[PDB]
Amino acid sequence: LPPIYCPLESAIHPRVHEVEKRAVEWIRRSGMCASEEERAWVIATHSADFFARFAPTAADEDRLLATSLWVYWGFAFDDTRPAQFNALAGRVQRALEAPSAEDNGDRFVPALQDIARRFRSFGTPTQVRRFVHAHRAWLSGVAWQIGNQARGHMPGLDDYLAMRLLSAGGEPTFAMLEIATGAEVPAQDLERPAVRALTEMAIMVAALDNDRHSLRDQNIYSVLMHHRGMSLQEAVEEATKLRDRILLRFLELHDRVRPGAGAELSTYLQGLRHGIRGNAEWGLRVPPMEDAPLTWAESPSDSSPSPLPGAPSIAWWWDDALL
Amino acid sequence: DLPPIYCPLESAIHPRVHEVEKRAVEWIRRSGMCASEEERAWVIATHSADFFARFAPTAADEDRLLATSLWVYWGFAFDDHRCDNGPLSTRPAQFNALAGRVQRALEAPSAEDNGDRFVPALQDIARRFRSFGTPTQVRRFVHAHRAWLSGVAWQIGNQARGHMPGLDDYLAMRLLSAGGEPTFAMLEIATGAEVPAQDLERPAVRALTEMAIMVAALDNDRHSLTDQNIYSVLMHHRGMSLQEAVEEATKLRDRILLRFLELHDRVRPGAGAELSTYLQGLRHGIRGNAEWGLRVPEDAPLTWAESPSDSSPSPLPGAPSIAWWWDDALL
């Protein structure tokens, strides 16, 4: 219902149409897709359009292609019992780390291994490891979510935000910014608690915007309705206040970190901001992407600068002493 | 009929092992980690300070060796009560949530235990790592720790199904579930030695780390002898006797150790100071793992093999997912 607060820069790679056409060929040829139907469903994610918003000035079209390919892959892979999923997640992650691993007729492994090959031809081994760790974090997230669903466990707010941080694919998505842009962010700059908090907050805002984008299971609305006793409308309102509050804290902490930041950390931070907006805008415009004018909230629904009560796993985002 | 371990590597133990052991035993009593005197005594009997004092035997700061040894105690305890025998040990759906909560607590100091006695203990370990290590070094441990839990989740998935993995899946799984990734990721935190990312993430050094982890995991399978281990894996997939399996396992573990040694000798000369200390750690830990395994209930002369049981310098047959360790062009 309520329009999205997102006062962040919107931009899209000028070569997005050229990257999309190469991506559509890669998808047709990959083996990822059994039937013509499934090729069309993956194409209809408009994943080039999504990631071209994340890295809108990427110098090398081929690096933007490679990173865009993983987004298609993630959507195809996400479209299994916990016991078999823990093994699949293990085998798929091994294939990302081990170029010698063999497919064993799993349709998703050669495809992932083709993306990994392209990442290893552009990226420093350091940037590839950052992606690998991000990819395992996402898989852990998915495993947690598949486990909760199989058991009929509706998690509380704390567990739900912890899990969604990972299961919504934001860690591997933001971990591709560097691979798309080129220059390596120094470990000292990327692993700073303040920058880790910016990354997780960008991820969390993108995940809650994706919860919103699918209202029409385990999402913020069911979690709040089950564990607080809310109507749907009361939960939509609470979810928005909560998300808007994480985003204010992101803007606050970004304005403290940005001034001192080196070239590469500065680029990465512009990426978080582009990605938050890009994800929101992509989710508004996706069914030929819709191009009718969009309305954006001028103001946050909740302007508190305090931690979310009921979500202690994210409270540390507000603890400047810790950062 | 189980043959001696081939391990021609430096055996060394920290001169202050007994002082660190004593502080570790005090911490284990205060930790709330152990439900009963019986479980305190079981954790103490892992001699985890003896174990990790062999991995960083010249660690300048005893507080760094202590913090590091604590996680080894914690891991043994967590694994015994939550991974290997807990109602979670065949309940993958529940383990996935626990893995998520425990891993979040390691990453987020603000996180709350929600009744899990393992969580406050790990958070104190993490607090020590954050006080000593760079945020980069702590991120390496955190990533390693998640890798380990992913492997345990795969193993518990297998158990629930009664699925006995083949060699390839078993090696890949056990690379993670034996806890070698977080164990070796604490080397740097014990020595103080921040290893530049360009040096640690080199494919060649990643291969050396994985091989050290793989040899120590196969040595643990040997120390611990339906159960998922290399002997059941070969018995099930190759229709071997236990005796033929024991000999097959020794062959393929020795052949991995020989590749570790060949690659180490090509990597070591070029290495800077911090990577050099890290590689000495891989070697000390392989040996430390094997010797701690043979001595843990102590001082009687050990016998080691003089020769590897197999010395093919080619990838292990039936294990494609590790064949890249022998690819010098990738490495």
Residue numbers in the entry:
A (entry chain B): 10 to 88, 98 to 234, 243 to 313, 324 to 359
B (entry chain A): 9 to 233, 242 to 313, 326 to 359
Task: Please give the exact wording used by the authors of the publication that reports this structure.
Spiroviolene synthase (SvS) from Streptomyces violens was first described by Rabe et al. and represents a bacterial class I diterpene cyclase that we were not able to produce in sufficient quantities for crystallization due to protein instability. Terpene cyclases such as SvS form a variety of complex multicyclic compounds with potent biological activities via carbocationic, electrophilic cyclization cascades of relatively simple substrates, either by metal-ion assisted release of an allylic pyrophosphate (class I mechanism) or by protonation of an oxirane/ene-functionality (class II mechanism). We previously reported a hypothetical ancestor of SvS—SvS-A2 26—which shares 77% sequence identity with the extant enzyme.
In particular, we noticed a surface patch of five consecutive ancestral mutations (205DREMH209) in the turn directly preceding helix H. This patch is located 17.9 Å away from the carbonyl atom of the effector residue (Ala186), so that it unlikely impacts the activity of SvS-A2. Moreover position 89 in the catalytic DDxx(x)D motif occupies a His in SvS-WT, but an Ala on the surface of SvS-A2. Exchanging these six residues on the surface back to the corresponding wild-type residues (205–209:DREMH/AQDLE and Ala89His) resulted in a surface variant of SvS-A2 with similar stability, despite an overall reduced expression yield. Therefore, we anticipated that the surface variant may constitute a more suitable structural template for homology modeling of SvS-WT, especially with respect to adequately capturing substrate binding. Using the surface variant as a template (monomeric with modeled loops, metal cluster and GGPP) resulted in a homology model (SvS-WT-Hom2) with overall higher sequence identity as well as optimal average scores for dihedral angles (Z-score of +0.541). Specifically, the local Z-score slightly improved for the catalytic DDxx(x)D and NSE motifs (arrows), even though the local Z-score for the RY-dimer decreased. Overall, we considered the homology model derived from the SvS-A2 surface variant (SvS-WT-Hom2) more suitable for mechanistic analysis of the extant enzyme. Redesigning the surface of the ancestral enzyme to restore wild-type sequence at selected positions provided a crystal structure representing an optimized template and improved the confidence in the derived homology model of the extant enzyme, in particular for regions involved in substrate and cofactor binding.
